[PDB]
Amino acid sequence: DIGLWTFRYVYNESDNVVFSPYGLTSALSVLRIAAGGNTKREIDVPESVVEDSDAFLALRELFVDASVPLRPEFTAEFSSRFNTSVQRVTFNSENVKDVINSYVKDKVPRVLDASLDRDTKMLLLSSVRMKTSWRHVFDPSFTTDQPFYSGNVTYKVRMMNKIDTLKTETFTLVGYSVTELPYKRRQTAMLLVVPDDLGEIVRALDLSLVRFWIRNMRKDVCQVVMPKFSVESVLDLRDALQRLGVRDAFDPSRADFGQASPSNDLYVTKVLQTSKIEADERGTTASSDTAIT
């Protein structure tokens, strides 16, 4: 829902964008254990997110500055629900980054200096990782340079090519197909959507449409010709989340995080996500870290 509806505000006509709706949703779900009143209500998110440890590794940590008083029932509630304890940290010192990166591995995304100010009093961090082969891999020796038509500009991409039997179907509103490429686990899979107008697909995407796709795709023998790709995206989601109704969390006057803190001085300034996806003949490697303030 909010996670999936956020993509329409980061989608780019002129660029390659990758995003993790799950990573956003998981972060907001933690943020919700700290909120109360209207602020919590606007964080409209499942209270429990799915987790499956073979299909993808997911991680959730909260770094609160050691000055900040936390209600003991919040850290108890936090620890009991996410099998992890709030990490008290000093957000002004110089090795705070070192402490936090040195903490995430074991159990390192240092592309988070974008998100640490010196007045930062909390860091809510959601990490998503997936590395999995295709069920039926492509053969690299048949991958060839082929053209890619973006409006009137044309590119030379490394295009993969295989024959495989997969679920597929055509659809309208504005003509496109959807094809399911299963990974070797077979609980995760890639839906590939090839349209005559991408921006129209973006403005329509939602979970109903996705389940519709899954019901109406039919097995068939296919030729799949698709590029290898590697994309990294650093996204600022504050504007999108506000447009999706999450407003109180950002407003210092109105932000109720009183379930976490008797301070009444904890609010969200930034929501940042850096994601990277890599697809090639052998499978897919995907990564996403969402940082709230």
Place this chain on the structure above:
Amino acid sequence: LTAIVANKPFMFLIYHKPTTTVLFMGTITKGEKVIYDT
């Protein structure tokens, strides 16, 4: 035979089948090396 050719801007969704949860998404509108022709 049925031919799927992603040689124009497209969308991908990486989702968890048991729970129908979208893990990753992206749109791909461009390559790196620009090409010209006659």
